[PDB]
């Protein structure tokens, strides 16, 4: 059949990429796809608001905020008179497959429209349409929705398209403003979006280590005014030169009265006398460019949406398309709309703990983790073990390392250990560059790129005797490594050295940090998102500059070593025409065929090309080799330029996703450490682990069990979850 | 011989680099430098608020907003009681050389303090001072000021440290917001800083082609409410999908009553019914990273400040350090403070045209240009010549090109020409890809990267006959080329072809656009700032890497061809340890020396290194050669990595400086064209480059530039920035 | 072959050593034997390659002499074995 796609409601960054994926996948599968402009308003007006879409019509859209086809509150669609016209215009062009990208209400109205769709019986009773067309274009209206929203508002979905982007906007402002708050001191109250949902405010507060945060779901609890001011004064006594307070638009006390940012300014000015400013971030949070995450999320969903449409039968209920635990799923639409309204109900009825449950387990996670790192119980009240736990960074620098260290340390001190910081990886370890570290020592770290402790790729196998000596000297009871494949190898070497050295017979756990994302036992690694955004950032600027002539193709080398994750996913996000990687062999025939494709592409109006090459994807087919092939076989048609991105892809500042990934998983790692230490008063495979992300949830996997899942020769995992996405790039280009 | 440096007042991006330049230059010249924390508050409290600074204490500061040593409104310093303590604490450590980095008032209070400094006679009359210390630490207080402020507030100075950066912040928001104003037809009123000075609001409005702007210096004039709404409705009739109104905090009508953003929202909502939002940008404008311009400006000034201090004698009055016409100068501080208050006085007394003069010639320029491009007189009222004037882009794409075309076109239509757009450089010219272009056709262009008309390096010499034919066919009366060295060569070829072809006997002028900044006759070129900012960003990240690993040195190749501008100035802004360029020959001895310096640097705590190499700086000493040298000689101490940036370092959307440079100089070029047409075949002086030479913009005949040009390496012979080479070595 | 230098792995050389041979050959060019011959074992140094040395000599010889480089290659296995 035919597929109509529209964007309705508040706009979110990534709507454009969704539309693109729906048009491209629809055409690829041989459907016809129409744009419906201006949300449901276009559907009501009909005429030229419905226009068939070709391949070319959704190029240059990917990297652009908002929607190229428009959203619109449409009142007429709230009336049967309006919905009648809508059905009429859809039948007028044979569209009974509908893809609505929008928010909580947009989706609510789509659900209603499916149910009423045998309002073609009404159009029959008038001059609307022929008798048999009530049967052909039957009561079978096939509806699939995608949630576009910065709020992480909807209940079916783990993530909504636009949240990551908006969070980039929020943290861009927060990082910017920090520098003016140090100089001056100054306490800054910032007002973020979330009239009804606090997700954005919470994940912002986490990503900037904010000093306090206000959510509608979890009100402050009586006697917070004193309790907040006590914390702020403690900060000035710690010589912290600023405070950041994050406040959701719809913040509230435990009796549903608003807590406004101006009310917080007056409390701080009144009680503490500090110099204080309010910033109302506003519609910037809907602006800017889609982050890599939102582009890849939206892309995966557009594709799944179109699949869900075609697989649908008149029996299958309308669904919403979502990524839950990094897997595409269809959820019944009616039930999803219902559960979201329940959350609002719980709040209205002062059942706040309910409102938090109803938001989900991950929402409670962010919240709870935030508290642990934001508030410290006075030393008196944290009793606890006389255990020394060490934190270290191993491998190349990776954005998020500092956030992870901050989390581990604070969680460990909260758990009542003494925390030791080991400097310069195993280098420093061997040279006993070890010093105790405290709560304040890691203040300010969340948003710092690189590694403050310092990192080195050097492995510990040659320095076992020296390293063991330091563990003895410093009475190190356990170890937390934050790092890449080198860290993994470090654990295996220390595991084997246990027999020769008792000092290693302690619990050791690692959390993965590397721009490459090549650590076995985790689908993701701290810092890869930052590099994906850097690559995406870079391609955007490349398309921006030299618009006019075109007939140019850019070959761009990416990091990763043998791991193709960056090349592949950055290729998706940047809408690359090809991404060459080690994990999928290619021969000269493959290259010549892409070249011939791009040569035909240059006959269309999209006279540009973008080709990524993983840095170690082929010993013979180098970046130069491919540049030379493409240059030569393009001679009449196009030319090329090459860029080796290089070390910039480690990041300036870590992206929000890498900060919160670092923060959260490092905390989960320390919990595990303290639990292992509690069991004494002691060494097998299960006390040395990688803690990574596997599909739905985080799990501690013994290094012994990962050897068989590892390619040691190329330093990547054997099965890698993202290889199932390879068909997408070809389709979506 | 000791120097105190402090930051006072609103913080500005680039203060850190200034402090860095003052500490590094001070030490380089063998002075001792003390930090004074928290602006004048630190000076009042004394004690540990004053602390000596070493080399290492100002590393990693360059690339960071605000001030590492703090600013602080300090009321106490507004009182004699407070100023008495301050002097006491300065004498307590022997500091009578003072460098105050701050704003309007900060410098006002420094001036006052110098004058009152024989308030040591008061301290004597109490137990403050020994008698002879009133004489040793004499009435000789040596004060030098630098203006750190986003406001371009001060009168002595052409640019204040922080304006460019704040303008990046403003335009980052504006460009961000543009994509959400898509959906529907939202009108955005944005409230920028400028409580008394409108500069920031004006230059923002210019850089985003704003639909209206409110300045305290130039109030709207009565009956603007209708006149504004007429303009906004005209836009919706032109199908423009948004309006952007820029409003200075201290905006005012002609009777000094405030014009608030909420008042503008209500007018637009009330009169036109459009969906409308207000954004109060706020302290974001002081945040973020110092732009390349501010880092280099601050750096140049810190160095000159310290020089001005040491050259000072008890005779020489306190001065403020400034870059005027791209040259360091000292201006008397007292007189500079006085003139700035005069501006405020002119406004308070409703002499607004005076307030604009007093701000300076460049302020009038931005303003007047903005009007010409924002408001169009109805076709009826612009009469004018039946001249067709063509606009073209020649050379590699350069950020700003689109802004320049927008400006030329609109200024030409305002001047009443018919404007012709020539597509794909001389390629399209030869193939007659020529079409008339209008006011609305260039709407939205200011912030667009690349070239919408299209650009090609191809020269016209082989297609003279075809090109001439198109000039005849389309009755082209004059030509404006926006482009790089290729455009310059294009003018020379056409100049020579005049005898063979009458069609070229018309006025032709070029404005320079290239990332390289290698066009003879101009100290700057449209697009170089955009690239500098990209390199700076990139180098910052690279050092961040190098600092994580430790004992690492990066060798990084940069663009420019034989032109060392980007390598050199990006090196300054990134705090590079070295920048190798064509224009300064270096031998193996020079390389070995930098290696030895970095080897000693690795004994300090800043165990990182950053080395830039211009891409065509030496045929033998390649990027690999240098990487191999450093790697081998560093074997016990450090390692290296190399990155070849590649032409992506040009960046994307033009930076605010390149948008306004494009806009302004292209308008000045059209003025010249219409004036030449009005005087009516021709001579050397009707073919020109319009570039920036030191103080002012000048039209220089291409014939006169041949002798100033290196045609073999396509760079100018004398290049102004080579005098900055000592800085990088010093400030590293 | 009466070479002016032969760089080999078994005797480490640094940049000072190279610069000194270059200066020697530069003075040699003031005599009547205005030629020079430098051999480099193929794996004598990871950083100081054949190109590196060619580039050093070329640059520091600019007023005095120029260079050419030849990588002999597999011909050295021989045509026919020598007696
Ligand atoms: N109950 C409904 N019945 C019919 N149409 C509806 C209904 N609710 C919403 N719509 C249509 O959906 C459009 C978008 O809804 P809304 O304004 O709620 O956007 P949204 O992004 O879903 O916002 P939110 O996330 O706050 O609910 C409306 O303009 C209206 O045309
Ligand atoms: N008239 C004055 N006499 C003494 N000190 C002054 C005076 N004006 C300002 N200062 C000093 O400078 C500080 C305030 O500077 P101000 O608030 O004017 O900031 P500025 O950045 O220098 O100027 P601008 O307000 O234009 O950005 C005060 O705390 C005071 O210490």
**B620: alpha, beta or left? (left if phi > 0; alpha if psi -120 to 50):** alpha
CB B498 within 8 A of CB B483: no
CA dist B474 and B632 (Å) reads 64
B7 beta partners: B101
B36 beta partners: B6, B50
- DSSP string across A58-85: GSS-TT-SS-SS-----SGGGSHHHHHH
Terminus-to-terminus CA distance in chain C, angstroms?
A: 20
Residue of A464, A480, A484 lying closest to A472 (CA atoms) = A464
Q: Which ligand is nearest to the CA of B67?
A: 2
HSE of A575, CA atoms in CB hemisphere, 13 A: 26
CA dist B37 and B167 (Å) reads 27
Give the C-alpha distances (Å, rounded to integers) separating B284 from A16, A212, B11, B102, B276. 28, 20, 12, 18, 22
SS3 A185: coil
CB B597 within 8 A of CB B615: no
CB A704 within 8 A of CB A690: no
Two tokens at A583? Answer: 């994990």
A54 is catalytic: no
B2 beta partners: B32
Question: Which residues, 6 or more positions from A432, have their beta carbon under 8 angstroms from its beta carbon?
Answer: A469, A470, A473, A474
CB A42 within 8 A of CB A50: yes
> Breaks in chain B follow which residues, C to N over 2.5 Å?
680
Q: How many residues does chain B have?
A: 732
In total, the C-beta contacts within 8 angstroms joining chain B to chain C are: 36
Q: Residue with structure tokens 């840095």?
A: A615
Helix A199-207, helix A656-678: angle, nearest 10: 80
CB A351 within 8 A of CB A389: no
CA dist B176 and B284 (Å) reads 14
- DSSP 8-state symbol, A441: G
In chain C, count H helices and then E strands: 2, 2
Question: Which residues, 6 or more positions from B716, have their beta carbon under 8 angstroms from its beta carbon?
Answer: B518, B519, B520, B521, B708, B709, B710
Contact A179 B64 (CB under 8 A): yes
Q: How many CB atoms lie within 10 A of CB B93?
A: 14
CB A277 within 8 A of CB A1: no
CA dist A38 and A49 (Å) reads 8
Residue of A109, A98, A97, A47 lying closest to A72 (CA atoms) = A109
CA dist A179 and B15 (Å) reads 11
What radius of gyration, in Å, describes the C-alpha atoms of chain A?
A: 27
Determination technique used? X-ray
CA dist B623 and C52 (Å) reads 11
CA dist A51 and A637 (Å) reads 31
CA dist B387 and B415 (Å) reads 10
- 3-state SS track over A10-47: CCCCCHHHHHHHHHHHHHHCCCEEEEECCHHHHHHHCH
Residue of A148, A108, A90 lying closest to A321 (CA atoms) = A148
CA dist A405 and A445 (Å) reads 8
- C56 CB neighbours in chain B (<8 A) are 588, 620, 625
Two tokens at B61? Answer: 């500061």
CA dist B4 and B10 (Å) reads 19
Long-range contacts of B363-366 (CB under 8 A, 24+ apart): B363/B199, B363/B202, B363/B217, B365/B664, B366/B199, B366/B202, B366/B203, B366/B206, B366/B660, B366/B664
CA dist A108 and B662 (Å) reads 49
HSE of A449, CA atoms in CB hemisphere, 13 A: 25
CB B346 within 8 A of CB B357: no
CB B197 within 8 A of CB B151: yes
CB A690 within 8 A of CB A700: yes
CA dist B703 and B687 (Å) reads 8
Sign of torsion over alpha carbons B466, B467, B469, B473: positive
Sign of torsion over alpha carbons B124, B129, B133, B137: negative
- DSSP 8-state symbol, A161: B
List the catalytic residue out of A11, A151, A441, A658.
Answer: A151
Q: Residue with structure tokens 């009404």?
A: A122
Q: Which ligand is nearest to the CA of B155?
A: 2
CA dist B708 and B688 (Å) reads 14
B691 beta partners: B698
Q: Is A552 annotated as a binding residue?
A: yes
Q: Probe ligand 2: pick from B102, B105, B199, max atoms within 8 Å of CB? A: B105
Chain centroid to CA B460: 34
CB B240 within 8 A of CB B443: yes
Two tokens at A238? Answer: 């710690």
- DSSP string across A354-401: HHHHHH-HHHHHHHHHHHHHH----GGG------EEEEEEESS--TTH
CA dist A166 and A656 (Å) reads 10
| Closest B-chain CA to C51 | B625
CA dist A385 and B219 (Å) reads 70
A180, A541, A641 ranked by CB distance to B286: nearest: A180
B600 beta partners: none
Long-range contacts of B345-354 (CB under 8 A, 24+ apart): B347/B196, B347/B216, B347/B217, B347/B252, B347/B256, B348/B256, B350/B254, B350/B255, B350/B256, B352/B217, B352/B218, B352/B219, B352/B254
Pocket of ligand 1 (CB under 6 A): A 8-10, 40, 73-74, 77-78, 102-106, 108-109, 112, 149, 153
Terminus-to-terminus CA distance in chain B, angstroms?
A: 23
Q: How many CB atoms lie within 10 A of CB B125?
A: 9
Query: Which ligand 2 atom sits closest to the C-alpha of B40?
Result: 31
CA dist B192 and B200 (Å) reads 7
Query: What is the signed CA dihedral for A36, A42, A45, A49, rounded to 10 degrees?
Result: -50
- DSSP 8-state symbol, B269: H
List the catalytic residue out of B151, B424, B427, B537.
Answer: B151
| Closest C-chain CA to B595 | C15
HSE of B471, CA atoms in CB hemisphere, 13 A: 23
**A282: alpha, beta or left? (left if phi > 0; alpha if psi -120 to 50):** left
CB B556 within 8 A of CB B643: yes
Do β-strands A327-332 and A319-324 pair in parallel, antiparallel, or remain unpaired? antiparallel
CA dist A304 and A26 (Å) reads 11
Q: Is A585 exposed, middle or buried (0-12, 13-18, 19+ CB in 10 A)?
A: exposed
- B71 CB neighbours in chain A (<8 A) are 183-184
- DSSP 8-state symbol, A198: -
CA dist B548 and A400 (Å) reads 12
| Sheet arrangement for strand B687-693 | B434-437, B418-422, B388-394, B476-483, B508-512, B687-693, B696-701
| Closest B-chain CA to A7 | B183
- B641 CB neighbours in chain A (<8 A) are 646-647
CA dist A652 and A448 (Å) reads 8
CA dist B579 and B611 (Å) reads 6
In chain B, count H helices and then E strands: 25, 24
CB A373 within 8 A of CB A633: no
Two tokens at A542? Answer: 């490349």
- B643 CB neighbours in chain A (<8 A) are 644, 646-648
Two tokens at A668? Answer: 């989960």
Q: How many residues does chain C have?
A: 83
Residue A196 C-alpha, separation from nearest chain B C-alpha, in angstroms: 21
CB A530 within 8 A of CB A616: no
Alpha helical stretches, state H, B446-564: 464-473, 485-497, 528-549
- 3-state SS track over A278-322: EEECHHHHHCCCCCHHHHHHHHHHHHHHHHHHHHCCCCCCCEEEE
CA dist B412 and B479 (Å) reads 11
Q: Residue with structure tokens 């435990």?
A: A254
CB B540 within 8 A of CB A450: no
B394 beta partners: B456, B483
- Give the experimental resolution in Å: 2.8
Do β-strands B50-52 and B32-36 pair in parallel, antiparallel, or remain unpaired? antiparallel
CA dist A439 and A411 (Å) reads 9
Residue of A291, A60, A267, A274 lying closest to A159 (CA atoms) = A291
| Sheet arrangement for strand B276-280 | B212-214, B243-248, B187-192, B276-280
Question: Which residues, 6 or more positions from A291, have their beta carbon under 8 angstroms from its beta carbon?
Answer: A13, A14, A164, A165, A168, A533, A536, A655
CA dist B674 and B688 (Å) reads 14
Q: Residue with structure tokens 């990693």?
A: B60
Phi and psi (nearest 5°) for B548?
Answer: -65, -40
Report CA(B595)–ligand 2 centroid distance (Å). Answer: 45
CB B554 within 8 A of CB B611: yes
CA dist A530 and A653 (Å) reads 8
Q: Is A238 annotated as a binding residue?
A: no
Q: H or E segment at B411?
A: helix B401-414
Sign of torsion over alpha carbons B10, B14, B16, B18: negative
CA dist A548 and B399 (Å) reads 12
- DSSP 8-state symbol, B258: B
SS3 A235: helix
Binding site feature residues of B for beta-D-fructose 2,6-bisphosphate: 457, 514-518, 552, 559-561, 615, 641, 647-650, 714
- B588 CB neighbours in chain C (<8 A) are 15, 19, 56, 59-60
Q: Residue with structure tokens 């072959």?
A: C1
Report CA(B256)–ligand 1 centroid distance (Å). Answer: 45
CA dist A701 and A685 (Å) reads 9
B588, B624, B633 ranked by CB distance to C56: nearest: B588
Q: Residue with structure tokens 């935030």?
A: A370
Residue whose CA is closest, atom 19 of ligand 2?
B9
Give the C-alpha distances (Å, rounded to integers) separating A228 from A266, A373, A585. 13, 15, 58
CA dist B660 and B446 (Å) reads 8
Q: Report the alpha-carbon angle A503-A508-A509, nearest 5.
A: 170
Terminus-to-terminus CA distance in chain A, angstroms?
A: 23
SS3 B334: helix
Q: Report the alpha-carbon angle B562-B568-B569, nearest 5.
A: 125
CA dist B219 and B213 (Å) reads 10
Q: How many CB atoms lie within 10 A of CB B183?
A: 24
Q: How many residues does chain A have?
A: 733
CA dist A436 and A417 (Å) reads 11
CA dist C5 and C28 (Å) reads 13
Phi and psi (nearest 5°) for B211?
Answer: -80, -25
What are the strands, taking DSSP E only, across B261-408? 276-280, 319-324, 327-332, 388-394
Domains present along chain A, CATH in parentheses: 1-165+289-346 (3.40.50.450), 166-288+347-378 (3.40.50.460), 379-529+653-712 (3.40.50.450), 530-652+713-733 (3.40.50.460)
Question: Which residues, 6 or more positions from A484, have their beta carbon under 8 angstroms from its beta carbon?
Answer: A394, A395, A396, A398, A512, A513, A514, A516, A518, A519, A525
SS3 C59: helix
What radius of gyration, in Å, describes the C-alpha atoms of chain C?
A: 14
């Amino acid at each position: 059949s035919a597929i109509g796609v529209l964007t309705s409601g508040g706009d979110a960054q990534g709507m454009n990429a969704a539309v693109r994926a729906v048009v491209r996948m629809g055409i690829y599968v041989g459907a016809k796809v129409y744009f419906i402009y201006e949300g449901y308003q276009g559907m009501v007006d009909g005429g030229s608001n419905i226009a068939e879409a070709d391949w070319e019509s959704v190029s240059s859209i990917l990297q652009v905020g908002g929607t190229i086809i428009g959203s619109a509150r449409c009142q007429a669609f709230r009336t049967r008179e309006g919905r009648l016209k809508a059905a009429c215009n859809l039948l007028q062009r044979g569209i009974t497959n509908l893809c609505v990208i929008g928010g909580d209400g947009s989706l609510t109205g789509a659900n209603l429209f499916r149910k009423e769709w045998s309002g073609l019986l009404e159009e029959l009773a008038r001059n609307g349409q022929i008798d048999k067309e009530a049967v052909q274009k039957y009561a079978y209206l096939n509806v699939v929705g995608m949630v576009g929203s910065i709020d992480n508002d909807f209940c079916g979905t783990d993530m909504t398209i636009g949240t990551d982007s908006a969070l980039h906007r929020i943290i861009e402002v927060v990082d910017a403003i920090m520098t003016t708050a140090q100089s001056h001191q100054r306490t800054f109250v910032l007002e973020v979006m979330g009239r009804h949902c606090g997700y954005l405010a919470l994940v912002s507060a986490l990503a900037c280590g904010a000093d306090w945060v206000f959510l509608p779901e979890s009100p402050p609890e009586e006697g917070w005014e004193e309790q907040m001011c006590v914390k702020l004064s403690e900060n000035r006594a710690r010589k912290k030169r600023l405070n950041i307070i994050i406040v959701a638009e719809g913040a509230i006390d435990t009796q549903n009265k608003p807590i406004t940012s101006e009310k917080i300014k007056e409390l701080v000015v009144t009680q503490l006398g500090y110099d204080t400013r309010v910033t109302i971030l506003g519609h910037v949070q809907r602006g800017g460019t889609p982050s890599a995450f939102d582009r890849i999320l939206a892309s995966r969903m557009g594709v799944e949406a179109v699949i869900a449409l075609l697989e649908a039968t008149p029996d299958t209920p309308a669904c919403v398309v979502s990524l839950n635990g990094n897997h595409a799923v269809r959820l019944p639409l009616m039930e999803c709309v219902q559960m979201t309204q329940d959350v609002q109900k719980a709040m209205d009825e002062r059942r706040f703990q309910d409102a938090v449950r109803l938001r989900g387990r991950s929402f409670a996670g962010n919240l709870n983790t935030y508290k642990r790192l934001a508030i410290k119980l006075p030393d008196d009240q944290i009793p606890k073990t006389n255990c020394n736990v060490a934190v270290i960074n191993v491998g190349a620098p990776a954005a998020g390392m500092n956030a992870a260290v901050r989390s581990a340390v604070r969680v460990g001190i909260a758990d009542g250990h003494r925390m030791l910081a080991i400097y310069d990886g195993f280098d420093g370890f061997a040279k006993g560059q070890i010093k105790e570290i405290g709560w304040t020592d890691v203040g300010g770290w969340t948003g710092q790129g690189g590694s403050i402790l310092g990192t080195k790729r050097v492995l510990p196998g040659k320095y076992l005797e020296e390293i063991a000596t330091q563990m003895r000297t410093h009475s190190i009871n356990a170890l937390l490594i934050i790092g890449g494949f080198e860290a993994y190898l470090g654990l295996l070497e220390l595991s084997a050295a246990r027999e020769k050295h008792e000092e290693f017979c302690v619990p050791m756990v690692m959390v993965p940090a590397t721009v490459s994302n090549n650590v076995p036992g985790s689908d993701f690694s701290i810092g890869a998102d930052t590099a994906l955004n850097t690559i995406t950032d870079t391609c955007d600027r490349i398309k921006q500059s030299a618009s006019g002539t075109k007939r140019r193709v850019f070959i761009i080398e990416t990091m990763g070593g043998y791991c193709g994750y960056l090349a592949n996913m950055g290729g998706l996000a940047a809408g690359a025409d090809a991404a060459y990687i080690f994990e999928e062999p290619f021969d000269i025939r493959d290259l010549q065929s892409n070249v011939e494709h791009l040569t035909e592409k240059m006959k269309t109006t999209i006279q540009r090309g973008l080709v990524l090459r993983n840095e170690s994807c082929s010993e013979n087919y180098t970046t130069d080799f491919i540049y030379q092939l493409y240059s030569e076989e393009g001679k009449g048609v196009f030319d090329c330029r090459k860029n080796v991105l290089g070390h910039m892809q480690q990041g300036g500042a870590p992206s929000p996703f890498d900060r919160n990934f670092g923060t959260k998983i490092s905390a989960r790692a320390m919990e595990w450490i303290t639990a292992k230490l509690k069991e004494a008063r002691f060494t097998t495979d299960d006390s040395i682990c990688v803690l990574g992300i596997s599909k739905r949830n985080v799990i501690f996997q013994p290094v012994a069990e990962l050897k068989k899942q590892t390619d040691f020769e190329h330093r990547i995992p054997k099965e890698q979850w993202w290889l199932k996405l390879r068909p997408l790039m070809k389709i979506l280009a």
